[PDB]
């Protein structure tokens, strides 16, 4: 009742009528690459990394924002999907500078755990690499806005849960930027909690800045006691 069997790689599963292709393929234990998407946020689509070749169609669709019709064959690995996940993640790895000796998210960036598995082998660009300038906002958010692959993820968070309407999009085409037009500081509750959301190492912590790389720590779970909600 209230379901459609969709053959994800030729294998049945029953979802709600009106869910997403992403949640369907993640239900059967698979990962499609995720840049312009978050579960705890709204949904946009302006990275165009999830691209699956749907069966009985010459075109390619993106799994972020579309419903699922009567049961398709969501052909995950094809000889054309790998001509797309290689495709998009060759452009955005060009207009970007050669950091990571010094990029402080250097052990967990999503241009670094996608780029071994998916994507191409070498480069053919071979000169270019625009370089914008940075600024300061508060004494907590160490700020390199050069890297900033414009996935529109920090931007919606101002309209999301933290209701401070502060950020925007300034520019057109190749040249757009993310930071505040005026030099207004941005600080309230949750204001230091953006540096987890930024999926590359363009945003990071100010006191933590130059200490140690994230493959030497020992992750032990615990609880903080500085408030009554735990």
């Amino acid at each position: 009742s209230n379901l459609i069997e969709v053959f994800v790689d030729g294998q049945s599963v029953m979802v709600e009528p009106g869910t997403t292709v992403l949640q369907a393929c993640e239900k059967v234990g698979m990962q499609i690459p995720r840049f312009c998407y978050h579960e705890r946020l709204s949904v946009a689509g302006n990275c165009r990394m999830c691209l699956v070749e749907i069966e009985k169609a010459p075109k390619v669709v993106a799994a972020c924002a579309m419903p699922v019709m009567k049961g398709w064959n969501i052909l995950t690995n094809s000889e054309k999907t790998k001509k797309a996940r290689e495709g998009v993640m060759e452009f955005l790895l060009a207009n970007h500078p050669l950091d990571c000796p010094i990029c402080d998210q250097g052990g967990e960036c999503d241009l670094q755990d996608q780029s071994m598995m998916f994507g191409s082998d070498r480069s053919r660009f071979l000169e270019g690499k625009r370089a914008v300038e940075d600024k300061n906002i508060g004494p907590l958010v160490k700020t390199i806005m050069t890297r900033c692959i414009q996935c529109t993820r920090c931007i919606r968070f101002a309209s999301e849960i933290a209701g401070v309407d502060d950020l925007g999009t300034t520019g057109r085409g190749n040249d757009m930027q993310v930071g505040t037009y005026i030099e207004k500081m941005f600080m309230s509750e949750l204001s230091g909690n953006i540096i987890d959301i930024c999926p590359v190492g363009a945003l990071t912590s100010k006191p933590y800045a130059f200490t140690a790389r994230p493959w030497e720590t020992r992750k032990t779970e615990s609880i903080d006691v500085m408030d009554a909600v735990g």
């Binding site: 000889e79 790998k82 290689e86 994507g119 191409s120 082998d121 070498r122």
Partner: protein, 52 residues
């Protein structure tokens, strides 16, 4: 010389295959700077993933 042929009566006569390469006709040095060819489908427009 007379100490020479006593080495040539004993255990045959070699005179050229010395146990040292310390003399001449050991390769001393090599001049040119090297450059390596980059061959096996390193190029573009056909060399392309999901084929390899």
């Amino acid at each position: 010389r007379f100490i020479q042929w006593l080495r040539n009566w004993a255990s045959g006569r070699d005179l050229q295959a010395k146990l040292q390469l310390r003399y001449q006709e050991i390769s001393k040095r090599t001049q040119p700077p090297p450059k390596l060819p980059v061959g096996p489908s390193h190029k573009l427009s056909n060399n392309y993933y999901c084929t390899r």
